[PDB]
Design a protein around this ligand. Structure first.
Ligand SMILES: N[C@H](CC(=O)O)Cc1c[nH]c2ccccc12
Ligand code: NA
Ligand code: NA
Ligand code: NA
Ligand code: NA
Ligand code: NA
Ligand code: NA
Ligand code: NA
Ligand SMILES: [Zn+2]
Length: 866
């Protein structure tokens, strides 16, 4: 498989302006007729190269003449000797039932559905499958009326008919030009939740949510969230929906979360279906964010699309930023910011140090499905957020308005976006553009001085980005570095220099620079990189008492949490070193005391308390170390949990009881109290065993909603309490017919600290609720083991590696996209000790030798082994 390079982009030799599709649908053999109106822009000797994969060509006509000047080669139909303007007609066959990879047109249970992003439309017919070719689509669908009573495609339903032999047809027209990755087709039988939303200007939009028969009771929250999304995009960004119908279809077989196909979004059912006995608070908030995300793509992705796939972050960074803003505006902005920072530091930073490191705008791709990444998405959003920090809301909105004014109806680049922001705001972003071209996490080092004679505070800030596997050359970035200075009473010291206020967002643009502040009337305690103002590692030599001071006084809730993280980090590092010498945990009492103060502070928001009381994950802890010891990290996390549970036992129980709520509501104050209560329970589960077992068993049985039931079950597994097996078995007996609910249980099994966890995981491959044909089941059992149980995955005997090789040997042939997601823990081999490296390298060499190695895996394996 061949690399493609961003610098090789060229405008296409041909455009298509209009495509009329007919599908004669059948799960075994579908016949596609595609009539495209085309225009040749290049030279007469440049042939038309149409992408096509696994298609059976039936016929090719040019202006209704059977065409003899063509050939088929690997992945392409190459058509020569064409006029300047012509009608292309292709007929071809495909087989949805054979499509296990879930790209193109495939089967989801008894439904037929599509996924075309990035390059799936070429699995449906021969086409210019590239996102800088926009065309107006019409789609006619012909099918068996009993099996497929609903026949959906993008746009408006413009025609309908009945045929002989129990067949019917519908035709759809989507008036907005689109690239083909935005095409969708759905055929099947569903229940339909119907509602309406009236836009700010008075357009009435029909809303239709298609779910599997019997699931209407699980649809209203997603409907509510769609309406909320529509209203919010009007209020925040001034954006209205542009069609008269908005369709969402929930399907059980889907590789990612959802897909923004124009007017016909297709969703993994995980991010649609919710009822209080089946879904947690987090599931409700995820549904809200993913419904929002796909909605927001209607402008940032659909109305303006991507020139080429290197520009993916143009839509993904900006749409993630939008979904974060939505969630943050509706919910707790602090909890949102905290969680997104956890993801960046604990998962994205690791990618940026890995063999798959890339800039948010990649320069080189072999398989584009490998680049739907933490980096493109989450770091992409941080980059957009930096623009927001530099411009402020008003200028940022002006940049959005200029971006749409220039590029509405076209395919654009990341550079076009940055230029719109610069031109509308008058802020220079020439240096800032380097965040698009440079991979790796910058390390910002801060040293400071207080001069009591002049009342000056001096900050010397330096930056460096280490070389990454993809880039040997690194340069300084334009880093927005937000600060605040606190006096001894916890009040903010005004920032000023030479009699003038100074903006608290410092522009760190050099390898090293100094900033001097005047009128600093007391030796300050600084809050540094406030609200994680740039996606960087911070090196500053905090004292523990500066950190506990910030936990108490800092103005933004984020800084309070982050100070607590820095306080913990030091003692995590200590305790991993101690573990490796066989010593027990050591922790100064003033640390336990800082957490006791949080638990007993009556003025603190319970949402914030809960996040302070949620220890860093094993992934976040891993990022503290040059060489990861996953066993020591897991054991230290547990021991820190046990120690705090013992030290804070009375306080934990008091807060647990005080946050009891008899009614369940999906409402931010209620969620916050319940999240705190459950954080207390999780510590309590690691305390005295009898009381633990009683609290946990009782919560599980009395819970009137899945958030509280799963928090209990999860605590029983984590702490290996006596009730564990009985509770787990009850869950299975109650919920085995419900795959989404069982995913939660598979995750608990896969992440269990029990000694025989691998053996249980292998056994669960035969469980009545498991199947290798379903990406959700695969991720919940296999993926959770490999990704979220690093202590077991990284068992010294190599057994976790061998297990993953076996699974991936199947998945390489069945569903390479899922295979590539699952291989990720193995490509991190350089972060581990020599003996684990040896074994992981041998696993990777084994996979490298598979027959029919997919491009998806080949890319990752070759980078990892280099
Ligand atoms: N824009 C969507 C997801 C999103 O909204 O960002 C991308 C997507 C969905 N399913 C896929 C399968 C393979 C490759 C890409 C995808
Ligand atoms: Na013609
Ligand atoms: Na076009
Ligand atoms: Na809010
Ligand atoms: Na995130
Ligand atoms: Na301005
Ligand atoms: Na510290
Ligand atoms: Na990590
Ligand atoms: Zn997206």
């Amino acid at each position: 498989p061949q690399a493609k390079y961003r610098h090789d982009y060229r405008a296409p030799d041909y455009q298509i302006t209009d495509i009329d599709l007919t599908f004669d649908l059948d799960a075994q053999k579908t016949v596609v007729t595609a009539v495209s109106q085309a225009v040749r822009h290049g030279a007469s000797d440049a042939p038309l190269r149409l992408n096509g994969e696994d298609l059976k060509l039936v016929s090719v006509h040019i202006n209704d003449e059977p065409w003899t000047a063509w050939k088929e080669e690997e992945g392409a139909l190459v058509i020569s000797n064409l006029p300047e303007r012509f009608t292309l007609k292709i007929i071809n066959e495909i087989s949805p039932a054979a499509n296990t990879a879930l790209e193109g047109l495939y089967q989801s249970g008894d439904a037929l559905c599509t996924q075309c992003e990035a390059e799936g439309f070429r699995h449906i017919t021969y086409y210019l499958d590239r996102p800088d070719v926009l065309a107006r689509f019409t789609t006619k669908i012909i099918a068996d009326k009993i099996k497929y009573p609903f026949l959906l495609s993008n746009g408006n339903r413009v025609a309908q008919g009945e045929l002989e032999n129990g067949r019917h047809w519908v035709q759809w027209q989507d008036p907005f030009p689109k690239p083909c990755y935005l095409f969708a087709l759905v055929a099947g039988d569903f229940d339909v939740l119907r509602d309406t939303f009236t836009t700010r200007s008075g357009r009435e939009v029909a809303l239709e949510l298609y779910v599997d028969r019997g699931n209407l009771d699980r649809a209203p929250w997603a409907m509510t969230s769609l309406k909320n999304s529509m209203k919010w995009d009007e209020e925040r960004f001034g954006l209205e929906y542009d069609l008269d119908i908005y369709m969402i279809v929930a399907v059980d077989f889907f590789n990612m979360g959802a897909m923004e196909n124009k007017g016909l979004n297709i969703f993994n059912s995980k991010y649609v279906l919710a009822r209080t006995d089946t879904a947690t608070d987090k599931d409700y908030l995820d549904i809200e964010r993913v419904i929002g995300h796909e909605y927001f793509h209607n402008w940032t992705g659909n109305r303006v699309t991507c020139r080429d796939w290197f520009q993916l972050s143009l839509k993904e960074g900006l749409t993630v930023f939008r979904d974060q803003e939505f969630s943050s505006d509706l919910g707790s902005r602090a909890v949102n910011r905290i969680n997104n920072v956890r993801t960046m530091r604990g998962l994205q930073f690791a990618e940026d140090a890995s063999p798959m490191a890339h800039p948010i705008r990649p320069d080189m791709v072999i398989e584009m499905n490998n680049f739907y990444t933490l980096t493109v998405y989450e770091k992409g959003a941080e980059v957009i957020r930096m623009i927001h920090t530099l411009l402020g809301e008003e200028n940022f909105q002006k940049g959005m308005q200029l971006y749409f004014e220039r590029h509405d109806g076209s395919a654009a680049t990341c550079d076009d976006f940055v230029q719109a922001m610069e031109d509308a705001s008058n802020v220079d972003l020439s240096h800032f553009r380097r965040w698009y071209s440079q991979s790796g996490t910058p390390i910002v080092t801060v040293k400071d001085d207080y001069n009591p004679e002049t009342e000056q505070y001096t900050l010397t800030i330096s930056q460096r980005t280490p070389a990454t596997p993809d880039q040997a050359e690194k340069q300084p970035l334009h880093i927005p570095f937000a600060i605040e200075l606190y006096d001894n009473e916890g009040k903010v010291i005004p920032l000023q220099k030479g009699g003038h206020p100074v903006n608290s967002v410092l522009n760190v643009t050099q390898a090293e620079q100094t900033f001097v502040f005047d009128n600093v009337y007391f030796q300050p305690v600084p809050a540094l990189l406030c609200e994680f103002s740039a996606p960087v590692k911070l090196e500053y030599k905090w004292s523990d008492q500066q950190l506990t001071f910030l936990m108490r006084h800092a103005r933004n809730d984020f800084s309070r949490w982050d100070a607590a993280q820095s306080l913990l980090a030091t003692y995590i590092k200590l305790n991993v070193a101690r573990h490796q010498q066989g010593q027990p945990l050591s922790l100064p009492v003033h640390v336990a005391d800082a957490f006791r103060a949080v638990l007993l502070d009556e003025k603190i928001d319970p949402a914030l308390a809960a996040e302070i009381l949620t220890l860093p994950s094993v992934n976040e802890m891993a990022e503290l170390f040059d060489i990861i010891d996953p066993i020591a990290i897991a054991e230290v996390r547990e021991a820190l949990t046990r120690t705090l549970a013992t030290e804070l036992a009375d306080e934990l129980l008091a807060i647990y009881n005080a946050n009891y709520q008899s009614e369940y509501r999906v409402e931010h104050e209620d969620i916050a109290k319940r999240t705190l209560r459950n954080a207390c329970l999780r510590f309590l589960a690691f305390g005295e065993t009898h009381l633990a077992d009683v609290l946990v068993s009782k919560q599980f049985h009395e819970a009137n909603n899945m958030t509280d039931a799963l928090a209990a079950l999860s605590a029983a597994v984590a702490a290996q309490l006596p009730c564990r097996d009985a509770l787990m078995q009850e869950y299975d007996d109650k919920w085995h017919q419900n795959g989404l609910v069982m995913d939660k249980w598979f995750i608990l099994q896969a992440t269990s600290p029990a000694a025989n966890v691998l053996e249980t995981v292998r056994g669960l491959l035969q469980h009545r609720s498991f199947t290798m044909s379903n990406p959700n089941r695969i991720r919940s059992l296999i993926g959770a083991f490999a990704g979220s149980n690093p202590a077991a995955f990284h068992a010294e005997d190599g057994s976790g590696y061998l297990f993953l090789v076996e699974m991936l040997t199947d998945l390489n042939s069945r569903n390479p996209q899922v295979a590539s997601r699952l291989i990720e823990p193995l490509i991190r081999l350089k972060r581990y000790d020599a003996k684990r490296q040896e074994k992981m390298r041998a696993a990777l060499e084994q996979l490298k030798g598979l027959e029919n190695l997919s491009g998806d895996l080949y890319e990752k394996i070759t980078k990892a082994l280099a």
